Each structure stands twice: as structure tokens, then as C-alpha cells.
Amino acid sequence: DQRFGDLVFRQLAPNVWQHTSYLDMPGFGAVASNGLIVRDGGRVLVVDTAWTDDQTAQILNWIKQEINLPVALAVVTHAHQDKMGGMDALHAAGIATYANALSNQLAPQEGMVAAQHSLTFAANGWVEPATAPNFGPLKVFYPGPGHTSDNITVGIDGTDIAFGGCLIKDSKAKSLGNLGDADTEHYAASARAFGAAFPKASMIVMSHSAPDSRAAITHTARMADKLR
Amino acid sequence: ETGDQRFGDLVFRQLAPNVWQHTSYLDMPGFGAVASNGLIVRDGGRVLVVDTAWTDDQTAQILNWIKQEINLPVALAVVTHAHQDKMGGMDALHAAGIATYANALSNQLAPQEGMVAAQHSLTFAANGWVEPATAPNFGPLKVFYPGPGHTSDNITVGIDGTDIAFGGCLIKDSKAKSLGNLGDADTEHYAASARAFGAAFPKASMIVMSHSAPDSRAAITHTARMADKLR
Ligand SMILES: O=C(CS)Nc1ccc2ccccc2c1
Ligand SMILES: O=C(CS)Nc1ccc2ccccc2c1
Ligand SMILES: [Zn+2]
Ligand SMILES: [Zn+2]
Ligand SMILES: [Zn+2]
Numbered sequence: 001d002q003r004f005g006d007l008v009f010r011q012l013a014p015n016v017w018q019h020t021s022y023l024d025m026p027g028f029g030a031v032a033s034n035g036l037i038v039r040d041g042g043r044v045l046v047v048d049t050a051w052t053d054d055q056t057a058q059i060l061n062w063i064k065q066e067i068n069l070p071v072a073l074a075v076v077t078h079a080h081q082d083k084m085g086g087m088d089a090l091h092a093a094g095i096a097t098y099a100n101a102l103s104n105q106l107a108p109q110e111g112m113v114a115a116q117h118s119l120t121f122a123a124n125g126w127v128e129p130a131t132a133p134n135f136g137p138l139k140v141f142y143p144g145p146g147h148t149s150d151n152i153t154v155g156i157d158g159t160d161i162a163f164g165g166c167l168i169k170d171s172k173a174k175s176l177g178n179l180g181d182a183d184t185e186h187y188a189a190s191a192r193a194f195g196a197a198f199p200k201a202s203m204i205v206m207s208h209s210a211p212d213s214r215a216a217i218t219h220t221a222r223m224a225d226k227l228r
Numbered sequence: 229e230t231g232d233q234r235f236g237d238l239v240f241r242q243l244a245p246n247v248w249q250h251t252s253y254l255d256m257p258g259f260g261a262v263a264s265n266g267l268i269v270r271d272g273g274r275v276l277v278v279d280t281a282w283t284d285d286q287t288a289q290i291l292n293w294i295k296q297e298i299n300l301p302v303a304l305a306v307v308t309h310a311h312q313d314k315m316g317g318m319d320a321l322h323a324a325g326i327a328t329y330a331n332a333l334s335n336q337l338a339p340q341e342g343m344v345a346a347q348h349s350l351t352f353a354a355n356g357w358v359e360p361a362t363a364p365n366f367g368p369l370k371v372f373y374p375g376p377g378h379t380s381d382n383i384t385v386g387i388d389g390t391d392i393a394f395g396g397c398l399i400k401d402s403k404a405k406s407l408g409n410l411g412d413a414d415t416e417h418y419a420a421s422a423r424a425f426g427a428a429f430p431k432a433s434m435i436v437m438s439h440s441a442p443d444s445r446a447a448i449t450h451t452a453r454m455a456d457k458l459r
């Protein structure tokens with residue numbers, strides 16, 4: 001764990017790091033959110049902002065210091081503040097941003113800045129390549145509604161890593177923290193679909209837990225089974 | 229009502245010179261017959277369908293009524309989410325040679341829901357309007373994804389050249405007491421999605437919906453106000 005400003009960075013693989021940012025909430029301090037940073041040849045790719053613009057600027061600052069390669073694009077995994085709260089820092093820096101079309105449609109209602117480009121998905125959940133050109137190792141998959149209607153996931157090609165975002169919680173989790181915008185009928189199938197889409201991922205990275213094994217997927221699905 | 233026609237178990241009501249509502253019924257134990265409405269649109273030399281009936285056999289009845297009453301080929305159908313009242317009859321559409329379209333997400337959910345997927349997937353811009361390249365030759369059908377509400381995948385359809393907009397199961401009429409939301413509803417965004425449908429078709433004065441007879445725009449307002457209370 002490397003501290004840099006108020007953020008934490010953890011190398012997960014030779015070309016992959018987890019970024020972690022924290023926000024005090026009423027009655028619960030320092031709520032963590034994780035995203036990813038990926039080195040792809042001569043460029044860097046980001047998955048998710050931090051909670052705030054200032055924190056997301058610090059992600060860019062850490063990249064400059066520790067990797068020193070331009071950030072070519074970012075993908076954000078749904079329209080909540082932990083994932084899209086720092087869009088302005090990316091746009092200020094000229095970084096192209098991508099999100100599920102539905103995330104961009106929800107953004108204004110959620111008080112988020114929309115990404116500059118929209119991803120669309122085939123009926124099997126895989127991103128349409130016309131909408132995700134030149135994504136390098138980021139393999140984007142829409143698993144179905146679960147945590148939200150718009151949640152998307154990202155496999156990191158060539159590594160053991162798949163990012164479930166806020167859809168997956170770790171195997172020690174006690175609840176899904178599902179809310180009005182969760183789809184409790186389909187959550188379990190969407191969680192299993194993420195697992196089936198990245199069948200050889202052995203390190204599951206998540207927004208609100210430290211990385212876990214594939215048991216995080218199964219444990220999350222089994223919790224969701226009870227919500228139907 | 230005077231003017232409604234019957235073919236088998238189906239009821240048809242003409243709403244405008246080139247638009248009819250189709251109504252089919254499914255018996256639900258303890259409650260009885262539940263109506264579901266869709267649309268039939270005559271577009272020059274062809275017919276376009278919005279939504280199947282609850283079953284394959286009921287959907288075949290729609291197509292046979294079209295042949296008898298309109299006698300133009302059915303070019304395509306749009307279906308408005310992956311529930312049985314809207315997609316229960318996909319096999320019948322396919323057997324009749326009708327090209328079918330649904331939200332990509334509807335096609336992704338269809339297998340989990342016991343439904344057959346449409347042959348083609350519609351995708352949507354960030355402003356909700358369908359991407360034209362996914363909706364070829366749709367004529368007067370203007371397809372709009374208003375956001376999550378009744379389900380994550382619910383879509384809506386305005387009929388150009390008419391005063392009609394179809395809210396499917398997202399919109400209930402101005403006399404409705406509840407929304408009937410289940411685990412797949414998005415109760416946080418439902419209200420804004422209903423209002424977005426109204427804003428997408430701001431001149432429509434006849435609102436058609438799946439589970440109420442046609443209403444004024446009060447159906448949109450009342451639906452959104454009911455949804456406000458679920459947040
Ligand atoms: O995590 C997300 C988006 S997935 N949002 C929040 C919002 C408020 C919270 C309050 C206390 C603890 C965690 C919280 C997490
Ligand atoms: O099954 C669907 C799919 S949207 N819709 C309805 C609509 C109204 C109903 C009323 C009583 C019982 C079941 C009902 C089911
Ligand atoms: Zn979230
Ligand atoms: Zn989150
Ligand atoms: Zn429905």
C-alpha cells in the first residue's frame with residue numbers, strides 16, 4: 001500500500017494497480033472506493049474515478065510520478081459518486097471518457113458529469129466493439145441489472161484480474177447494500193454472468209472490498225438469491 | 229365498447245386512421261383476466277406491430293386479424309420489455325416471417341425470463357433516443373428509452389403523424405391506485421423516467437399503455453406522482 005495524498009495505491013500485477021479513495025459519510029468515516037489503473041504499452045488506462053475531482057486529480061498525479069505515461073482513456077462503471085464523481089478532473093486533463101449509455105443518461109439526475117462517449121452492449125453482454133475501439137486490455141461486459149441498472153464490469157486481459165465494481169462484494173460481506181435502484185430479481189444472475197464472462201479470472205477486484213478470489217462472486221450471488 | 233372488434237380471444241380498437249390497439253388477456257389465479265395492450269400501425273403498404281400478446285396463439289390471432297382487416301404484410305415488430313405480456317408471443321411473430329426488435333437488454337434478459345429473444349437488438353443514445361442504425365426502416369415509430377422504471381429495459385414508442393405515444397407498462401392511467409412494482413423496478417428513477425417519456429413526446433395527447441385504456445397526458449403526471457412517493 002502506497003499512500004499519496006489522501007489516496008492509496010496498490011500494485012496488483014506488473015501492469016495493474018488499484019486506486020483507493022475515501023469519503024467521510026454521516027456516522028461512518030472514510031468509506032473506501034476502489035478502481036484500477038492499467039499500463040498498456042505506451043499509455044495508461046483508468047477504470048473509475050475517485051469520489052471527488054480533487055481526489056481524481058491526485059490519481060493523475062500519482063500516474064505521472066510512478067508510471068509517467070499519458071492517460072489515454074478512462075471507463076467508469078456506473079452513475080454513482082464513487083465511480084463518476086471525479087469526471088471533471090479527467091475532462092480538464094483532456095482524457096477521453098466512456099461509460100454505459102445508460103450511465104450517461106442517468107448522470108444528470110445523479111448530479112454527475114456524463115462521460116464524453118457511450119458504450120452499448122450486445123444481447124450477450126459484451127460491449128459492441130464500434131463503441132469501445134482501442135481499449136487495449138480492458139474487456140468490458142454488461143452483466144445485467146443488479147447493483148444498478150447500468151452497472152458494467154471490466155476484465156483485464158492477460159492478467160488474473162476482473163473488476164466487478166459495486167456489483168460484487170467480498171466473501172466476508174454481510175449484505176449487498178441494495179437500494180431502490182437495485183434490481184433484486186436479476187442481481188443473482190447478473191453476478192453469476194460476470195463470473196461466467198471472465199471464467200479464468202482468479203483475482204476479483206471490487207469497489208468496496210479488498211481484492212478477493214472467485215468466492216466473492218459466488219458468495220455475492222448466493223446473497224442475492226435470498227433477495228428474489 | 230361500440231367499435232371494438234374481436235378475433236378469437238383478442239380485442240381491437242381503432243385509435244386513429246392508421247393505428248389500432250390490440251388487447252389480449254391472461255388469467256391469473258385469485259384475480260382473473262388481466263388485459264395487456266399493444267399497437268398495430270399501418271405505414272403505407274405495410275404494417276408494424278408494437279408488443280406481442282401474452283401467448284403464441286394469441287399473437288397468431290393478432291396477425292390473422294391484421295390479414296383480414298388490413299391485408300398488408302407485417303414488416304416488423306418492436307417489443308417493449310422482457311415480460312410475458314410483451315414478449316410471450318415472439319415465436320409466433322418469427323413463424324410469420326416478421327423481423328423483431330427489442331432493447332438489447334430485453335434480449336439479454338429474455339432467457340432468464342423464459343422468453344424468446346427478438347432477432348435484433350436496439351441500442352440507445354445517452355439522451356434516450358434509439359440509435360437509428362439499430363432501427364432500420366421504422367417508418368413512423370419513434371423509439372425512446374426513458375430510463376429505468378417499471379424495469380431496467382422498458383422502452384416507449386411514439387407514432388409520428390398521430391397524437392399517440394405508447395408508454396407500455398411504465399405508464400398507468402390517471403385513475404390507477406398503484407404501480408405494481410416488483411424487485412426489477414427501479415423505484416429511485418421511476419418518476420424521472422415517466423417524466424422523460426412525457427418530455428420525449430410533448431405533443432402527444434393520447435397516451436396508450438399496457439394495463440389501462442388510452443388516457444390523456446394525466447396518465448404520465450399521475451404515474452410520476454405515484455413514483456415520487458416510492459423514493
Ligand atoms: O457506495 C456508494 C455508491 S455504490 N454510495 C454511498 C453513499 C453513501 C454512503 C453512506 C455511508 C456508507 C457508504 C455510503 C456509500
Ligand atoms: O404480468 C405483468 C407484466 S408487466 N403485468 C401485470 C399487470 C397487471 C396485473 C394485475 C393483476 C395480476 C397480475 C398482473 C400482471
Ligand atoms: Zn453504486
Ligand atoms: Zn460503490
Ligand atoms: Zn412488465
Ligand SMILES: [Zn+2]
Nearest residue numbers: 311313397438
Ligand atoms: Zn405489463
